[PDB]
Design a protein around this ligand. Sequence first.
Ligand SMILES: O=C1NC=C[C@@H](O)N1
Ligand SMILES: O=C1NC=C[C@@H](O)N1
Ligand SMILES: [Ca+2]
Ligand SMILES: [Zn+2]
Ligand SMILES: [Zn+2]
Lengths: 154, 153
Amino acid sequence: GMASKWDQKGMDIAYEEALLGYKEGGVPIGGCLINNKDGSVLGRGHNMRFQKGSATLHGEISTLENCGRLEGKVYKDTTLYTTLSPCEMCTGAIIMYGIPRCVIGENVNFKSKGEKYLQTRGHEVVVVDDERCKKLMKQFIDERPQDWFEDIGE
Amino acid sequence: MASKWDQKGMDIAYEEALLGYKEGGVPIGGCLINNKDGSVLGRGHNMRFQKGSATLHGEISTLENCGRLEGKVYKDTTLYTTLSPCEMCTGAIIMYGIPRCVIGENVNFKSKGEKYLQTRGHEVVVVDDERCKKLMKQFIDERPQDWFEDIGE
Ligand SMILES: O=C1NC=C[C@@H](O)N1
Ligand SMILES: O=C1NC=C[C@@H](O)N1
Ligand SMILES: [Ca+2]
Ligand SMILES: [Zn+2]
Ligand SMILES: [Zn+2]
C-alpha cells in the first residue's frame, strides 16, 4: 500500500508507546489508531500482559480498548499503527471493526499469516521496516525469550 | 467426533450469557475447558456495557479470565461460545492454538471466522442450542443499535 501523510506521526506514537511499556517491564509493542483525514489520535496503547496479567491485551488490542466504545462508522476511515506485525488475534480485531489500513513498524522479529490475511480480506498493509522498533523488539526476545513465547501462545 | 464435556461447557457458557444479560450487557458467554480431565480454566461474558470495553467480547473476556498461561496449556482445550465467533475472537482461537470451538448457534450471527477456523485445521461444532438462540435474538430485537456496535456496524 502507498504511504500516507500521517504515517510518520502514527509510527512515532506507537514506538513511544512501545518504549513506555518497555520501561514498565512489559512486552515492547505499542500502537495507536488515527483518523485518516485530520490525523487525530483516537487512542494509543501498548502490551499490558505483564502490567495487568493480561492474556488478551496485546499492543493492538490495548490500543483499541483505549479508544473506548465507538460507533461502527468511526473505525471505517482510520489507520491502525503497530510497531510489530499483527498476530491472528490482532488481525481479526482490525478485520472485525473494518479498519481499512494497517501500518507495521517491522516484520523481521515476528510475522504471522495475519499480515497476508489482511490483504486477502481487502485491507491495505504497509511495512515501514522501522529500525528503532526492530532493535527494541530484538532486545526483548534475546533477554526474555520465555516471556515472548508466552505472548504468542508458544 | 464428540467430546464428552460439550454439554458441560455449553451449559456454563449459557449461564454466563444469562449473567451478562442480567447485568444489562450483550448476552454472550463462554468458558475454556481442558480436554483431558475436563477442568474449567475460565469463564466469562461480553463486558462492553459493564466496562465500556470495545474488545471484551464473550470469547475475549473468557480468555482474559483464564489469566496468563503457558502456550501449551491452550493446545488441548475446547473453547465454548454461545454465538459463532467474530473475526477477532476467531483470531484469538487461532493465535493460542485452541484445537476445538463448540458453538451454541450461528443463526443470529456468523462471520467468515467459522470457515476460516476450519481452513486453519480447527474443529468446529455448531450445537444449535435454542436457549442461546432465543436469548440472543431477544437482545437484538430490543437493542439493535447496541448489537451493531458490538460487531462494528
Ligand atoms: O502485543 C503484541 N504481541 C504480539 C504480537 C502483536 O500482535 N502485539
Ligand atoms: O461477544 C461477542 N460479540 C460479538 C461476537 C462474538 O464473537 N462475541
Ligand atoms: Ca515456557
Ligand atoms: Zn496480537
Ligand atoms: Zn468476537
